[PDB]
Amino acid sequence: LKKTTGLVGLAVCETPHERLKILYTKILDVLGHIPKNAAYRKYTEQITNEKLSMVKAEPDVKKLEERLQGGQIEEVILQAENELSLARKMIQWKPWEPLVEEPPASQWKWPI
Amino acid sequence: RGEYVVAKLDDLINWARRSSLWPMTFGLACCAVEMMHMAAPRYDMDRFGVVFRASPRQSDVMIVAGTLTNKMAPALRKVYDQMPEPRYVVSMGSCANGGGYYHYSYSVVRGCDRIVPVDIYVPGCPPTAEALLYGILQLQKKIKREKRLRIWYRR
Amino acid sequence: TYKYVNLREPSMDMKSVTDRAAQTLLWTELIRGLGMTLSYLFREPATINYPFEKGPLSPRFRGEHALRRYPSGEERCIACKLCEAVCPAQAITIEAEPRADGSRRTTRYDIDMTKCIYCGFCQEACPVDAIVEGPNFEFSTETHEELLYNKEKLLNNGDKWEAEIAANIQADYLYR
Amino acid sequence: TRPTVRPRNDVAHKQLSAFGEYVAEILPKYVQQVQVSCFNELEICIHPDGVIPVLTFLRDHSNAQFKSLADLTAVDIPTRQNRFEIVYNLLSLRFNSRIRVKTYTDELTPIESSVPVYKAANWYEREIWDMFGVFFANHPDLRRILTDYGFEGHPFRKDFPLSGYVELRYDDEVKRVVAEPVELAQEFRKFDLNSPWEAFPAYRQPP
Amino acid sequence: ASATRFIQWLRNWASGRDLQAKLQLRYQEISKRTQPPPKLPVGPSHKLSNNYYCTRDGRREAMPPSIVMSSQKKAVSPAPPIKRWELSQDEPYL
Amino acid sequence: TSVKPIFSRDMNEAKRRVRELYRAWYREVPNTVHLFQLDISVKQGRDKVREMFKKNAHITDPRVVDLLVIKGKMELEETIKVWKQRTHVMRFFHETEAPRPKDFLSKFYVGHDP
Amino acid sequence: TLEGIKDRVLYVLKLYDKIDPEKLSVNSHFMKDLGLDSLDQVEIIMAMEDEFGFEIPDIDAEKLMCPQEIVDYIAD
Amino acid sequence: MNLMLALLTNFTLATLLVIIAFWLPQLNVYSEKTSPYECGFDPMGSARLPFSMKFFLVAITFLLFDLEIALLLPLPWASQTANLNTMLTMALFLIILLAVSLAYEWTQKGLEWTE
Ligand SMILES: CCCCCCCCCCCCCCCCCC(=O)OC[C@H](COP(=O)([O-])OCC[N+](C)(C)C)OC(=O)CCCCCCCCCCCCCCCCC
Ligand SMILES: CCCCCCCCCCCCCCCCCC(=O)OC[C@H](COP(=O)(O)OCCN)OC(=O)CCCCCCCCCCCCCCCCC
Ligand SMILES: CCCCCCCCCCCCO[C@@H]1O[C@H](CO)[C@@H](O[C@H]2O[C@H](CO)[C@@H](O)[C@H](O)[C@H]2O)[C@H](O)[C@H]1O
Ligand SMILES: CCCCCCCCCCCCO[C@@H]1O[C@H](CO)[C@@H](O[C@H]2O[C@H](CO)[C@@H](O)[C@H](O)[C@H]2O)[C@H](O)[C@H]1O
Ligand code: SF4
Ligand code: SF4
Ligand code: SF4
């Protein structure tokens, strides 16, 4: 087991495989309440399932870290927690809805 | 003779004051880096009797080493007022001399001599450490010329 | 590649533990630091004896400004105002008119030395090597007004310093 | 490889374009324009209502991870009815990438404070308020940061004069530093530099 | 350089280093303050032919930004994930 | 004409914020004079506060009123915490500036400014 | 102590110099009769908070426009 | 006498130096010069406001420990006693109880400053 993650304040996780399975499964559950055709759901389910596949099929932490390309396994756990927090927030924002308002005529024209 | 005595007494106090100049630990911007290089071993301002002291109550000279902004102006005037007399101001660098590169800014004082009286103006941006040392030695020779007791005698 | 600056595990063999106990109780690493300052006490100091000795400089040094002449004595400046246009500080002020012999010459050429940032752009911009920054850095004054140079002051600087300025330009003009 | 010409990195341009429409697909409620410059910088132009949703998504989404707010600034363009353009420059360490998010506002319209997303944004928003007068809603502590105490105006606006309106000096009668209308011994000399000949045909605007 | 032998020994011992091999005061190993004149090279555009400016004009190749989307399939990231750094083989631990 | 509010939804709500700010300034003047050791009286300080509120009496835009109140609160905070110095407090009284008469003739004699 | 409040309140309105005591009555409206404006009224309300030593919210304060209506208010 | 003469001379010499220091130099007193110092800006609040003491418990312990040394300083004289068995036992006893009290205050976190 790792003695240290190397990043100050990031504690080493004793059970990273199970923790990742909990988090990705939670992320998928939250996406279920997002509309099917929302691009956030389709993309996040796709990339979330890839990580869940890699955790299930790879028992060694170091070999799993190489597959995930997310840094330390504790870094990957934190990213999963961040994605789960974003998915909940997305439900109230509903950014899949059409553009709230067009900008004025020359709002983005440069040079003036 | 009274004149001979006050002439010699002027030399003593003038010698003591210029031989023991303590600048206030006061720096503002880039010019303070060259001021740091005057204290550094190559020039060793300490060897002339020039020693930094933090407290204005224990300072004889204010070296305005850098830009004076409007927000800073009341503070600079405050610590100048809090220096016991006699006290001297050396203006270092274009910013302190007259605004320099920021002369036309809305936030800069166009010369520290709008705020305090200035004894010596050291030109440059920044003046070399040697140029500042030349300015300090110029201040010393100004103090050497003072005639306080001679003028008092003829009052 | 990276390296760790502080990720090492002290050994726990009795000799190493005692070595550290002696360090803690006998102040061995503090005594060691005293040795370093002692060695400096007996090193020759780096101080130079200003003003009898001077810090080294190079021909490119940017100091007090000066207006130069041709060997005949005619002014090099022909009032093109390139130095005035480039000056980052707007330190230069120029007026010009046809001279009594028709020459294109300045009637005003001021440098506010309290505005100037001693950047040397003016001498880069000058097409005739008229305005230069000379090697003088010992010209601090007792009044602000003494640092507002007009054309007479700048020409006097050129006449005062031309011997050094010409030699400094000779050493460096092939890098320009 | 012409020696004096900056080389083109086409791989980055393709990668940033792909991610550009990736963000537009996911946040259509807010994204108004996406562009990639010829030196491979991706800019996302959004409606101001989407400052928190867009920034939160870029920080938190697993395919973005823009964890660092490199810079937050404003630009004043007086000819626009929304004269202030607010610019977020973000950095992604995971993907070694940068992205710029831009929105807009006017003198009287507040922008949501993004401190809840990036704690770095605290002082950047104080600077924008100080120098441009843009108000940020729900800022924990919004006040001047750069200008003098009691300073009036927002200096970085294009119509604020370079030398301001007041200057300082010490007045012996009142024994304090005073502020008075600005007079310059030498007025700043305005230079008209632009050549009357077009330089870059590629950027010509239609007549 | 002018220190006596005993003084050199004393300060060598005190510091634990041989201080005479790397003195911090400069003597004669520094360059002469007068040098021969240079003869600097020219650049790649110094030619008399095949040198039309329009073929070497970087500014006129700059283009307005490509509009990807305006308001007038696999997930992607801005770039591939960053490769993990390797430990130094010069000196991994300080 | 549909715009995002700052705080107040209408001038009636805005005027409430103004009154609360006026109370805060009115209460603070005695503290400012005492703490800063000013040589003006509390009446002068409160008259000046009234003068500053009066110059903006003609505003009818709730968003503009809200921004004036926000700045008023910031100015008050600078004073209460002695971030301002005596020079900053006294700048409201323009003590060192000579009167500029407003009659046509007086301007005519002195220069070209209208 | 209703009877005494009509004296306390009128005691304050007399100190506030802008008021003319001859023109002042327990029913004189601050705006129309006494020639005051919103900020003067606000200042009056602050003086009342001192004598009776309690806070009068703005929602409450704005309704008090005559010396009488304050007395009715203090009673509660 | 010698002692009182020596003390009087020292403190008179110091007093004369202060008298010269105040009456010899030229003075120029005004309000800003004599204002309290705080790095250029006016102080916020009186310097007489309470200043919390985070080592208050060590300070009280100092009183108790400072009296122990009054009990110990006679030890050089007590060592001249013929009854050295009792004296050595009571000397060691007193110092140990001082050490025990120190160890108690240490283990109970009395020597850590309040945060
Ligand atoms: C370890 C202790 C060290 C002690 C060191 C003692 C210092 C030894 C050197 C003494 C030099 C002589 C003193 C001159 C310095 C005076 C300060 C000064 O600059 O004033 C300028 C002033 C200048 O005054 P002024 O009239 O020209 O102008 C000032 C007024 N305005 C501001 C309007 C311009 O000189 C004097 O006023 C008088 C000078 C007299 C010099 C003779 C001094 C006599 C000493 C007796 C003083 C009476 C009090 C008794 C003190 C104890 C006596 C020893
Ligand atoms: C026959 C039986 C015999 C029985 C008796 C035997 C007794 C002898 C054996 C006992 C041990 C002997 C040494 C005791 C000396 C005191 C040691 C000591 O107190 O050092 C510890 C102290 C704390 O060090 P620290 O690492 O910070 O903390 C420890 C972990 N808590 O460390 C420090 O004090 C740091 C001090 C910092 C300030 C130092 C500044 C000066 C350093 C240079 C001084 C050189 C000494 C010169 C002395 C001159 C004497 C005239
Ligand atoms: C928290 C409570 C802690 C209490 C700790 C008490 C510790 C006391 C330890 C014993 C100290 C004295 O120890 C005792 O000293 C006496 C004399 O000094 C010694 O006595 C010895 O010297 C004396 C004379 O000097 C002779 O009379 C005697 O014949 C000889 O044996 C004892 O041999 C020794 O046992
Ligand atoms: C007869 C006199 C000589 C005998 C020594 C008498 C003094 C004894 C001192 C106390 C001894 C035991 O009491 C003390 O308890 C605390 C627990 O908080 C320990 O203290 C602990 O935290 C402090 C602060 O970080 C540090 O000292 C140390 O890192 C750690 O050990 C001490 O290591 C231990 O010494
Ligand atoms: S004068 Fe030049 S070096 Fe000195 S503070 Fe100003 S800009 Fe910096
Ligand atoms: S050195 Fe620079 S700032 Fe000074 S006059 Fe020349 S161009 Fe202007
Ligand atoms: S650039 Fe040279 S020639 Fe032209 S105005 Fe300046 S000094 Fe004169």
Total beta-carbon pairs less than 8 A apart between chain B and chain F: 3
Domain limits at F15?
1-114
Q: Please indicate if any CB of chain D lies within 8 Å of the CB of H31.
A: yes
Closest CB to F26: pick one of G38, G46, G61. G46
Q: How long, in residues, is chain G?
A: 76
Concatenated DSSP letters of chain C: -B-BSS------SHHHHHHHHHHHHH-HHHHHHHHHHHHHHTSPP----TTTS-----TT---SEEE-B-TTS-BS-----HHHHH-TT--EEEEEEE-TTS-EEEEEEEEETTT-----HHHHH-SSS-EEE-S-----BSSSGGGEE-HHHHHHHHHHHHHHHHHHHHHHGGG-
- Determined by cryo-EM
Give the gap in angstroms from C-alpha G49 to the nearest C-alpha of chain F.
Answer: 12
F 35-94 residues inside an 8 A Cβ radius of G: 50, 53
Q: Please indicate if any CB of chain C lies within 8 Å of the CB of B127.
A: yes
Determine contact, residues C169/C115, Cβ cutoff 8 Å: no
User: What are the structure tokens assigned to H63, written together?
Assistant: 């009183």
d(CA B75, CA B81): 10
Number of Cβ within 10 Å of residue B73's Cβ equals 23
Query: B71-74: long-range contacts at Cβ-Cβ below 8 A with a sequence spacing of 24 or more?
Result: B71/B107, B71/D147, B71/D148, B71/D149, B72/B28, B73/B109, B73/B115, B73/D168, B73/D170, B73/D177, B74/D176, B74/D177, B74/F85, B74/F87, B74/F88, B74/H40, B74/H41
HSE toward the beta carbon, residue B112, CA cutoff 13 A:
30
Q: How far is CA G68 from CA A112, D94, G51, G74, in A?
A: 63, 72, 16, 10
Chains touching F by CB (3 or more pairs below 8 Å) = B, D, G, H
Q: Is G65 left (phi over 0), alpha (psi -120 to 50) or beta?
A: alpha
Chains touching E by CB (3 or more pairs below 8 Å) = A, C, D
User: What are the structure tokens assigned to C65, written together?
Assistant: 């400004």
Annotated catalytic residue within G37, G50, G60, G72: G37
d(CA F7, CA D110): 10
Query: H52-61: long-range contacts at Cβ-Cβ below 8 A with a sequence spacing of 24 or more?
Result: H54/H113, H54/H114, H54/H115, H55/H113, H56/H114, H57/H105, H57/H110, H57/H111, H58/H110, H58/H111, H58/H113, H61/H105, H61/H110
> What is the best residue among B149, B150, B153, B154 to mutate for testing ligand 1's pocket, by most ligand atoms within 8 Å of CB?
B149
Q: What is the DSSP letter of E54?
A: G
Nearest residue to A26 via CA among A90, A88, A101: A88
Pocket of ligand 3 (CB under 6 A): H 84-85, 88-89, 92-93, 96-97
Q: Please indicate if any CB of chain G lies within 8 Å of the CB of F16.
A: yes
d(CA C122, CA C120): 5
Query: Terminus-to-terminus CA distance in chain A, angstroms?
Result: 60
Question: Residue B24 CA to chain centroid, in angstroms?
Answer: 9
Determine contact, residues C88/C119, Cβ cutoff 8 Å: yes
Does the beta-carbon distance from B78 to H35 stay under 8 Å?
Answer: yes
Residue H115 covered by a domain: no
Helix (H, G, I), strand (E, B) or coil at B120: strand
Closest CB to F67: pick one of D108, D148, D179. D108
- Which backbone phi and psi does G13 adopt, to 5 degrees? -60, -20
d(CA C133, CA F32): 53
Residue H1 covered by a domain: no
Determine contact, residues B77/B87, Cβ cutoff 8 Å: no
Find the helix or strand (DSSP H, E) in which A48 lies.
Answer: helix A39-57
Determine contact, residues C136/C88, Cβ cutoff 8 Å: no
Q: Please indicate if any CB of chain D lies within 8 Å of the CB of H32.
A: yes
Beta bridge mates, D167: D180
Name the amino acid, one letter, at F41: S
Residue H88 covered by a domain: yes
* C92 Cα–ligand 6 center, Å: 7
Determine contact, residues D84/D94, Cβ cutoff 8 Å: no
Determine contact, residues G41/G65, Cβ cutoff 8 Å: yes
d(CA D51, CA D103): 8
Determine contact, residues D134/D159, Cβ cutoff 8 Å: no
Please enumerate in sequence order all residues whose Cβ is within 8 A of that of C11, keeping only pairs 6 or more positions apart, or say none.
Answer: none
Which residue of H lies nearest to F36 if distances are taken between CA atoms? H42
Chains touching D by CB (3 or more pairs below 8 Å) = A, B, C, E, F, H
d(CA C119, CA A42): 59
> What is the best residue among B67, B68, B91 to mutate for testing ligand 5's pocket, by most ligand atoms within 8 Å of CB?
B67
Beta bridge mates, C132: C66
| Chain C residues with at least one Cβ partner in E under 8 Å | 1-8, 32, 35-36, 38-44, 46, 56, 171, 174-175
Domain limits at H30?
7-107
Residue G76 falls in the annotated catalytic set: no
Determine contact, residues F92/F86, Cβ cutoff 8 Å: no
Q: Is D138 left (phi over 0), alpha (psi -120 to 50) or beta?
A: left
d(CA G70, CA C69): 90
* H88 Cα–ligand 3 center, Å: 6
Task: Return the sign of the alpha-carbon dihedral for residues D132, D135, D136, D139.
Answer: positive
d(CA B68, CA B26): 12
Compute chain G's Rg from CA coordinates. Answer: 11
Please enumerate in sequence order all residues whose Cβ is within 8 A of that of F109, keeping only pairs 6 or more positions apart, or say none.
Answer: none
Please enumerate in sequence order all residues whose Cβ is within 8 A of that of C90, keeping only pairs 6 or more positions apart, or say none.
Answer: B103, B104, C115, D188, D189
Say if ligand 1 is within 6 A of residue B149 CB: yes
CA E20-E23-E25 angle, to 5 degrees, is: 140
Strand B88-92 to D166-171 pairing: unpaired
Residue H40 covered by a domain: yes
Q: Burial of H28 by CB count in 10 Å (0-12 exposed, 13-18 middle, 19+ buried)?
A: exposed
Residue H34 covered by a domain: yes
Atom 54, ligand 1: residue with shortest CA distance:
H20
Atom 17, ligand 3: residue with shortest CA distance:
H85
Residue H112 covered by a domain: no
Resolution of the PDB structure in angstroms: 2.3
d(CA F7, CA F65): 10
State yes or no: chains D and G have 3 or more CB pairs below 8 A. no
Residue H113 covered by a domain: no
User: What are the structure tokens assigned to C71, written together?
Assistant: 């060997």
Residue H90 covered by a domain: yes
d(CA E32, CA D80): 62
Nearest residue to C158 via CA among C66, C87, C78, C55: C66
| Number of domains into which chain H is organized | 1
| Number of domains into which chain F is organized | 1
Beta bridge mates, D170: D177
Say if ligand 1 is within 6 A of residue B15 CB: no
d(CA C155, CA C147): 15
d(CA A7, CA C142): 58
